[PDB]
Design a protein around this ligand. Structure first.
Ligand SMILES: COCCn1cccc1[C@@](O)(c1ccc(N(C)S(=O)(=O)c2ccccc2)cc1)C(F)(F)F
Ligand SMILES: COCCn1cccc1[C@@](O)(c1ccc(N(C)S(=O)(=O)c2ccccc2)cc1)C(F)(F)F
Ligand SMILES: [Ca+2]
Ligand SMILES: [Ca+2]
Ligand SMILES: [Ca+2]
Ligand SMILES: [Ca+2]
Ligand SMILES: [Ca+2]
Ligand SMILES: [Ca+2]
Lengths: 12, 229, 233, 12
């Protein structure tokens, strides 16, 4: 859940 | 009379504030094409979430929170921090909000985009009331920081931590106003009161969204992630 | 390092009024009882207590200097926006953190258990309860609750306020007095006035949760008495 | 509109 957020967070 | 620490922190904070808003192609604005405008906004929306997350990650303390609470805070701040960004980019002479560098939108453009007035007006009203407060770049940066560390946000596992993190940011904004404008003791209070306004504008925004459920209109799956119930 | 005679006066009157109204609202409601009368009776026991609270609150809003000077129309706008929030604040004063129930009568304590048997959803109950907990920790005293309620009532940005400018201006000397008072009674806590305002931000969000709850009632085939109905529907 | 409330405001 909340993958836009999770991904934007893990990114880089 | 800001301490060494505080001044540097605000500096780095305004650094990142532009180092993140400077950092894309979206479906073009029409000249049914309303369905092409709805696409257009949502994509600006998505861009902003991108900026807001990247900002948060650079705000000192944020990454000391566990993942779930970072989610919980960003979930609730996002609309709010947008609206702040939207007032900071309001041109009163033109009566238009401006989003990337040239895109210019008036209270009207927002209707063809497919929103009812019950949202469209409070948004602009808000952008005006913030003009009357006249904030500089450090003040937005601190205010945004303070908004993120809202311990009463739903589902926060570590309220006490989140509040401890918010504290130095409220100290800093407090001094910086006391200094920057010494005789207006009411400025600071009047600024925090904008946080109260945002929570209302947050609801208005929920109400706008739920309305789409009925107007037949789906948000991209990644925005729906954040705003649907 | 001391209040002004004016500020000392503003605060005492407000405290006097609250005491006056909190008394005067003490002079009997559908008692607390499972059947289908029993359940829609508990609904009754609550909403009735809610009525009483709304009264104590309107009663108190009239005694707040400067309020009855606004248009009668703005007076409605303000109480409508304010009432639930002042209710939650007052609810916080009734909160026992040790056992997590709110007191309303004198020796009658309600658990969130009870809130539920009374027709309320948890989406509502838990937030109310957590606000009551956090607010309670903040340890406001009489002067402070009183000022904060006055400050909340004179919120210019309420829906339908016809004369925001008058409203903002009424609020000011109140924000001013709270500011001074907290400066003098807790000098080294340079953050208390802030923490206090932060609670308005929480109330505003709570207001919207409360809306959810009220609208949730319709589809449930349950009506609010006309007074509640009057300011909430 | 808003009858009973308007009453409470006027009482006294
Ligand atoms: C043109 O504005 C682009 C979107 N945007 C980006 C940051 C802030 C914004 C903002 O306009 C804005 C914020 C959120 C929305 N949502 C309600 S939406 O994405 O679901 C939607 C619904 C219907 C039609 C189009 C888009 C709309 C505009 C603002 F300022 F109002 F908050
Ligand atoms: C036991 O408390 C009685 C009501 N009450 C009085 C002051 C404050 C309250 C409070 O419980 C409370 C405040 C408002 C409500 N409303 C949503 S209601 O009157 O429409 C209602 C609907 C369904 C069932 C019961 C009551 C409920 C509880 C509080 F604290 F949450 F704000
Ligand atoms: Ca930003
Ligand atoms: Ca244009
Ligand atoms: Ca009261
Ligand atoms: Ca319990
Ligand atoms: Ca508990
Ligand atoms: Ca019990």
């Amino acid at each position: 859940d909340h993958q836009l957020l999770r991904y934007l967070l893990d990114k880089d | 009379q800001l301490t060494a620490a505080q001044e540097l922190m605000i500096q780095q904070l305004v650094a990142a504030q532009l180092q993140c808003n400077k950092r894309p192609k979206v479906t073009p604005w029409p000249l049914d094409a309303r369905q092409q405008r709805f696409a257009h906004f949502t994509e600006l929306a998505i861009i902003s979430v991108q900026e807001i997350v990247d900002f948060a990650k650079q705000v000192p303390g944020f990454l000391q929170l566990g993942r779930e609470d970072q989610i919980a805070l960003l979930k609730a701040s996002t609309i709010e921090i947008m609206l702040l960004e939207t007032a900071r980019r309001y041109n009163h002479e033109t009566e238009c909000i401006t989003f990337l560098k040239d895109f210019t939108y008036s209270k009207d453009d927002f209707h063809r985009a497919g929103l009812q007035v019950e949202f469209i007006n409070p948004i602009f009203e808000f952008s005006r009331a913030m003009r009357r407060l006249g904030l500089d770049d450090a003040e937005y940066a601190l205010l945004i920081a303070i908004n993120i560390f809202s311990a009463d946000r739903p589902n926060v596992q570590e309220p006490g931590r989140v509040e401890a993190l918010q504290q130095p940011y409220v100290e800093a904004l407090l001094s910086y106003t006391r200094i920057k404008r010494p005789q207006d003791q009411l400025r600071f209070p009047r600024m925090l009161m904008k946080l109260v306004s945002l929570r209302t504008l947050s609801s208005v925004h929920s109400e706008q969204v739920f309305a789409l459920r009925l107007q037949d209109k789906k948000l991209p799956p990644l925005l729906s992630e954040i705003w649907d119930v």
